[PDB]
Amino acid sequence: RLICINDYEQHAKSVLPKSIYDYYRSGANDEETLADNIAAFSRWKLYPRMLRNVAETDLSTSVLGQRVSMPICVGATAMQRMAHVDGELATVRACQSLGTGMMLSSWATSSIEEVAEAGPEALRWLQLYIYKDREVTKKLVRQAEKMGYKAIFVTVDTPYLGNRLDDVRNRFKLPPQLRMKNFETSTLSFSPEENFGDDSGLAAYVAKAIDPSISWEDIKWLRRLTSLPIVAKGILRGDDAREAVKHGLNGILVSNHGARQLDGVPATIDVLPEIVEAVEGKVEVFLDGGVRKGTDVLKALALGAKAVFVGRPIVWGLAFQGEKGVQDVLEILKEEFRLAMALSGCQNVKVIDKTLVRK
Ligand SMILES: Cc1cc2nc3c(=O)[nH]c(=O)nc-3n(C[C@H](O)[C@H](O)[C@H](O)COP(=O)(O)O)c2cc1C
Numbered sequence: 001r002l003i004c005i006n007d008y009e010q011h012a013k014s015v016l017p018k019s020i021y022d023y024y025r026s027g028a029n030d031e032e033t034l035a036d037n038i039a040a041f042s043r044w045k046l047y048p049r050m051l052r053n054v055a056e057t058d059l060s061t062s063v064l065g066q067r068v069s070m071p072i073c074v075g076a077t078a079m080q081r082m083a084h085v086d087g088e089l090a091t092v093r094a095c096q097s098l099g100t101g102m103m104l105s106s107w108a109t110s111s112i113e114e115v116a117e118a119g120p121e122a123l124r125w126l127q128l129y130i131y132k133d134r135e136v137t138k139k140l141v142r143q144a145e146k147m148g149y150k151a152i153f154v155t156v157d158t159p160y161l162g163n164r165l166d167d168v169r170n171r172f173k174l175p176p177q178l179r180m181k182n183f184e185t186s187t188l189s190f191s192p193e194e195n196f197g198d199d200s201g202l203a204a205y206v207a208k209a210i211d212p213s214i215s216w217e218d219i220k221w222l223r224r225l226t227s228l229p230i231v232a233k234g235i236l237r238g239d240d241a242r243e244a245v246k247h248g249l250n251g252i253l254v255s256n257h258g259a260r261q262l263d264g265v266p267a268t269i270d271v272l273p274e275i276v277e278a279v280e281g282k283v284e285v286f287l288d289g290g291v292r293k294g295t296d297v298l299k300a301l302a303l304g305a306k307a308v309f310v311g312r313p314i315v316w317g318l319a320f321q322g323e324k325g326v327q328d329v330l331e332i333l334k335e336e337f338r339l340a341m342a343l344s345g346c347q348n349v350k351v352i353d354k355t356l357v358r359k
């Protein structure tokens with residue numbers, strides 16, 4: 001049946017309730033960037049070397065000092081138990097099997113501790129939102145430290161939620177049996193019994209809970225709060241990337257939030273070279289947005305990314321078959337990436353060079 005990532009999305013549309021599929025699929029507004037995140041990869045053309053000896057292709061690399069089996073990691077996607085009863089527990093188990101890392105959403109339907117218990121040997125990182133309540137925010141960071149998470153990815157592109165039109169039409173909220181499990185109060189847990197207005201429930205949750213005032217001073221606060229590596233997630237400008245380096249951060253995740261925040265920003269693959277240039281080798285640079293195929297991974301590494309993160313494909317894996325479905329999606333990406341390396345003449349990730357691509 002399902003042999004590529006597109007097949008998993010098509011299957012997910014056939015089995016998920018509309019409101020859930022739409023929440024996961026949607027971009028902001030007219031979804032111009034959503035289309036471009038994919039189309040932009042196709043404009044970058046590959047210039048493969050022949051006759052390089054590719055009998056033994058090594059996909060392994062490192063993310064912030066921690067070894068991974070491939071430069072393909074799981075990005076934070078909220079509320080995974082909407083897709084499959086086991087949600088984030090299924091995802092972390094699959095990541096452990098693959099030897100890759102899982103970035104856990106602050107808006108997960110499973111707690112920091114529950115995910116660590118399900119994937120004790122998995123490489124795990126926490127995606128952090130800065131809540132108006134700094135005591136909540138600190139508690140999340142402290143729990144990530146205690147529970148063996150290896151970095152914080154602080155999201156910097158969401159002072160307010162983007163306007164996802166289907167979520168407004170559908171009046172998106174959690175199904176009755178689920179909660180954001182990192183929080184205790186009805187509002188912070190996004191209880192679907194709380195009053196979140198007449199439009200998208202999630203946009204109202206953000207407006208109530210998440211601090212629109214945050215600034216570089218809050219990054220200074222976070223840098224002093226934890227010794228863990230910190231990655232700025234959602235940077236699209238070289239000047240902001242340089243500022244993140246000046247604040248002592250340890251990486252940049254070039255991201256447009258899966259095209260869900262400001263519509264009409266460029267595709268991440270198109271802004272990646274500016275960001276790689278701007279940081280001058282001082283920190284690792286990662287990419288997410290539109291990764292669906294092994295050749296997308298190859299292109300991102302050729303342009304200087306250390307690794308890429310996948311969002312929606314993971315959710316579609318869950319919707320098919322929980323842990324097994326996430327494992328299948330990651331195995332397809334790994335095999336497509338191996339083949340793309342081999343056909344391009346690359347024995348290992350260290351020889352994936354800039355001459356492999358042109359736009
Ligand atoms: C359904 C969904 C939920 C998401 N939830 C979060 C979140 O909780 N925190 C966050 O920082 N980013 C979140 N993102 C953004 C992703 O981390 C990532 O940037 C994006 O999914 C990458 O693009 P892709 O879906 O094309 O792979 C979400 C994205 C999607 C599609």
Ligand SMILES: O=C(CC1CCCCC1)Nc1cccnc1
Nearest residue numbers: 220223224226227228246247248
């Ligand atoms: O606080 C630090 C160091 C951190 C501390 C923890 C581990 C890595 C670096 N740097 C900083 C803070 C504010 C403004 N400029 C620099």
